[PDB]
């Protein structure tokens, strides 16, 4: 019956109501010209019709880097020795970044002592 | 599978 | 020569300095909020 | 039967370097 088609199209090959809606319509255009013998034939026909339906809709069912890292290993070693020559600190910005980041963590630790004590409505 | 009515 | 090696190794020479001046105005914001408490309430209450 | 016996016992019957050498050619010079 039609109940078996739902579990053989929307279930077997995964075909829900909407999927089977246009799946059973494709059979008409190519209905079996005679009473189908095998129960698998019907499923096969449905599956065969599903292919067309799916088609119709278009929805079917090394060391190079080791050589590279040694090149940057040379240039990183060359970068430190030129910064050593020109007396350029390569981390003066980074050391002052982490030293103000704990300094702005101190004033944050003082700023939330106000809002924990007083509250959000009073502070706003 | 997308249920298409 | 230092800039062209930092260009080669993709090393930002000011990433620490750009993040230094961007947290220094961020800690200036919370300071501008922190002294709004002490200007409003006072030093004895805040201590 | 030997197969089982054998089994039983477990005893059965490019240019990258051309690019690399030109890099060291620079550093040697």
Swiss-Prot record, chain B:
Gene designation per UniProt: FAS2
Assembly behavior: [Alpha(6)beta(6)] hexamers of two multifunctional subunits (alpha and beta).
Main function: Fatty acid synthetase catalyzes the formation of long-chain fatty acids from acetyl-CoA, malonyl-CoA and NADPH. The alpha subunit contains domains for: acyl carrier protein, 3-oxoacyl-[acyl-carrier-protein] reductase, and 3-oxoacyl-[acyl-carrier-protein] synthase.
Protein name per the record: Fatty acid synthase subunit alpha
Similarity comment: Belongs to the thiolase-like superfamily. Fungal fatty acid synthetase subunit alpha family.
Residues of the full protein shown: 141 to 145 of 1885
């Amino acid at each position: 019956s039609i109940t078996t088609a739902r579990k053989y199209l929307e279930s077997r090959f995964g075909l829900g109501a909407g999927r089977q809606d246009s799946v059973l319509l494709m059979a008409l255009t190519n209905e079996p010209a005679n009473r189908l013998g095998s129960e698998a034939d019907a499923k096969t026909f449905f599956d065969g019709i599903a292919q067309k339906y799916a088609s119709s809709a278009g929805i079917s069912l090394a060391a190079l880097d080791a050589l590279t890292a040694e090149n940057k290993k040379l240039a990183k070693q060359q970068l430190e020795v030129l910064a050593r020559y020109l007396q350029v600190d390569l981390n003066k910005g980074a050391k002052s970044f982490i030293k103000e980041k704990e300094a702005s963590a101190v004033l944050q630790k003082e700023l939330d002592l106000w809002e924990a004590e007083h509250g959000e409505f009073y502070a706003k | 599978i997308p249920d298409e009515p």
